[PDB]
Amino acid sequence: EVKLVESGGGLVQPGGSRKLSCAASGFTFSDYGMAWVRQAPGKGPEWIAFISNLSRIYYADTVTGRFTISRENDKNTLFLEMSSLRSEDSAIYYCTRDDGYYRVDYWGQGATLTVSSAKTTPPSVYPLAPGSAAQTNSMVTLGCLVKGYFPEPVTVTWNSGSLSSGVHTFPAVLQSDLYTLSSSVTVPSSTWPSETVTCNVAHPASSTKVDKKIVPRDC
Amino acid sequence: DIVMTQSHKFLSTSVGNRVSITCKASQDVGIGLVSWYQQKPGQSPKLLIHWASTRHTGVPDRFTGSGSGTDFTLTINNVQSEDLATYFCQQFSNYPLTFGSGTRLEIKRADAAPTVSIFPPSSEQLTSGGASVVCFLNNFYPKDINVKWKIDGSERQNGVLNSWTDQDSKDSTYSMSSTLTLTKDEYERHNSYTCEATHKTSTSPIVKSFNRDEC
Numbered sequence A: 001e002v003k004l005v006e007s008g009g010g011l012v013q014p015g016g017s018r019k020l021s022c023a024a025s026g027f028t029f030s031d032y033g034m035a036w037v038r039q040a041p042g043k044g045p046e047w048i049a050f051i052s053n054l055s056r057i058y059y060a061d062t063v064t065g066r067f068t069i070s071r072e073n074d075k076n077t078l079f080l081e082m083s084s085l086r087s088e089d090s091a092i093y094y095c096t097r098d099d100g101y102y103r104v105d106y107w108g109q110g111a112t113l114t115v116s117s118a119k120t121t122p123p124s125v126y127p128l129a130p131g132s133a134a135q136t137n138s139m140v141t142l143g144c145l146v147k148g149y150f151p152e153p154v155t156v157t158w159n160s161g162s163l164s165s166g167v168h169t170f171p172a173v174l175q176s177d178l179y180t181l182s183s184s185v186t187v188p189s190s191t192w193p194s195e196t197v198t199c200n201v202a203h204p205a206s207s208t209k210v211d212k213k214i215v216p217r218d219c
Numbered sequence B: 001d002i003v004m005t006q007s008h009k010f011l012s013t014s015v016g017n018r019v020s021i022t023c024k025a026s027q028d029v030g031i032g033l034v035s036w037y038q039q040k041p042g043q044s045p046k047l048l049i050h051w052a053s054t055r056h057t058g059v060p061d062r063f064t065g066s067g068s069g070t071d072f073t074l075t076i077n078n079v080q081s082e083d084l085a086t087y088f089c090q091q092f093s094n095y096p097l098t099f100g101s102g103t104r105l106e107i108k109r110a111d112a113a114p115t116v117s118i119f120p121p122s123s124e125q126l127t128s129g130g131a132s133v134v135c136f137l138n139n140f141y142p143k144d145i146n147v148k149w150k151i152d153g154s155e156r157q158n159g160v161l162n163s164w165t166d167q168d169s170k171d172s173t174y175s176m177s178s179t180l181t182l183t184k185d186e187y188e189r190h191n192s193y194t195c196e197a198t199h200k201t202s203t204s205p206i207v208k209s210f211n212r213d214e215c
Helices: B123-127
Strands: A003-007 A010-012 A018-025 A034-039 A046-051 A057-059 A067-072 A077-082 A091-097 A111-115 A124-128 A139-149 A155-158 A167-169 A173-175 A178-188 A198-203 A208-213 B010-013 B019-025 B034-039 B046-050 B063-068 B071-076 B085-091 B103-107 B115-119 B130-140 B145-151 B154-156 B160-164 B174-183 B192-199 B206-211
Touching (some): A003 A091, A018 A034, A034 A077, A046 A077, A057 A067, A124 A198, A124 B123, A139 A155, A178 B160, A178 B174, B010 B019, B019 B085, B034 B063, B071 B085, B115 B192, B145 B160
Parallel strands (some): A010 A111, B010 B103
Antiparallel strands (some): A018 A077, A091 A111, A124 A139, A167 A178, B019 B071, B034 B046, B063 B071, B145 B154, B192 B206
């Protein structure tokens, strides 16, 4: 199947440079024009750059003179070299494939870029166990507070993915130049605390991969 | 530049209704040279319609694209819960390629009361001197909800941070988390903490609380 896998996301300081990469799989790379499209907070999709199957190149006015799109057809890879980055450049960056007109019939998973002078900070991960009254209904809800990390994103799973039904992970809120996210999971009350429930949090920017068990308190 | 406009941020519909999602271009883009994309929650966009009216592979004909020039419509006849998504138009008549800001399709469902849960700060957080009290309000409908925090009966407003999920494609509900962050210094001096929610389904506010002289 068609695959587009973006790399190079992360945190860069204002005025800095960064190279995004996209590895294409599952089609003849040289038959297709390729593009970058971004989605920044508060904004809808915004086309950034396009490159023809072999070379014709177009840029959004907002990035001209700063960004360079290129491709290496021998390696099925698309690049976006970024320079003089600004805060406004912070966004999810999608690599996309066209057909024969500039209609993008396939979009990658997206890479998150944050431009900021704040430093990379690992999250503090706190287990949220319910109080006494909130146990032993038919269901029980547990939580995970992921606090004070930078930059986005963080990934949260419960029991390594086993529990995914009954999970709600909430969008991060940026406060104090730091992000805070929460996640809940709702399981039968016969399940917890008899069995262990763990939230697993990954913050690739800081090489954080934490497993936090939800333990009930002591009386 | 060609400006693409979608007048509706949100369109809400029950299963079975006809929804019309509209798009305007500021200049004549002809034929087509207009595309529709569909973006479901937790997914990247997918091509839905191109050349104004041609369905992409895999798209059922309850989706109909129409229009030419400057006025375009994506109609979803007999809409299904499967169609929960944001829909964006794009012109490809000239550079720069431009998008509308998207229309979100909300699936109407029967009213649903939130399941509200309140959590004291973790001992681990308290050790570092912070005290976040968390309230989850899960699986409700419709989307509008108001949360108030109280400490020993008195309303607290500063230090409250809220976050909302998008509509869930599995039960058409919303969820919300509300976090009251205090210093441990202040948290220590009070006993009762209360999360209070008002919703379409509530008469008296939904009240969830804990006292600290406890487990």
